[PDB]
C-alpha cells in the first residue's frame, strides 16, 4: 500500500509531464463549469473529477490503496465520456490521456 500509493504518485507526474500537455492541459484542475458556461454540468455529473484533486488526496493519504486511486482516475475520463457527445475535441483527448494512465497502471 505505503509503496503502491508512491508508485501512484509516479503515474499522476508522468500524465502532468509536458510531452502529454496538448491533451492533458483540461484535465489539470476541475472543470469551471461558471467561466465555460455548462450549466447543466453538475446536474449530469454528480462527482466531479480532476488531477490536481486526485494530487491533493494523495498527498493527504487520501487513498487506501492503487485501487482506490485508479478509481478517481477512471471517475476524471468517465464524467468526460458521459457528459460530452463522443465526437467532442475533449473526449479525443481524454482517450490519449487514459492511454497513458491503462499502461502505468497495468504494469505497477
Ligand atoms: C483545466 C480545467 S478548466 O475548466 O480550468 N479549463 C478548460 C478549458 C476548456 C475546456 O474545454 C475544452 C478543452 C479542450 C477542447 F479541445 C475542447 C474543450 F471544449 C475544459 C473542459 C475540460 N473538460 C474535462 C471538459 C468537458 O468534459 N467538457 C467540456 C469542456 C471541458 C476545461
Given at each position: 500500500h505505503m509503496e503502491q500509493l508512491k508508485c501512484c504518485s509516479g503515474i499522476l507526474k508522468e500524465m502532468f509531464?509536458?510531452?502529454?500537455?496538448?491533451?492533458?492541459w483540461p484535465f489539470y484542475?476541475?472543470?469551471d463549469v461558471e467561466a465555460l458556461g455548462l450549466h447543466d454540468y453538475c446536474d449530469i455529473i454528480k462527482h466531479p473529477m480532476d488531477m490536481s484533486t486526485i494530487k491533493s488526496k494523495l498527498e493527504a493519504r487520501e487513498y487506501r490503496d492503487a485501487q482506490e486511486f485508479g478509481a478517481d482516475v477512471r471517475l476524471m475520463f468517465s464524467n468526460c465520456y458521459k457528459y460530452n457527445?463522443?465526437?467532442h475535441e475533449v473526449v479525443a483527448m481524454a482517450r490519449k490521456l487514459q492511454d497513458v494512465f491503462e499502461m502505468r497502471f497495468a504494469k505497477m
Open positions: 509531464a509536458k510531452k502529454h500537455a496538448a491533451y492533458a484542475k476541475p472543470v457527445p463522443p465526437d
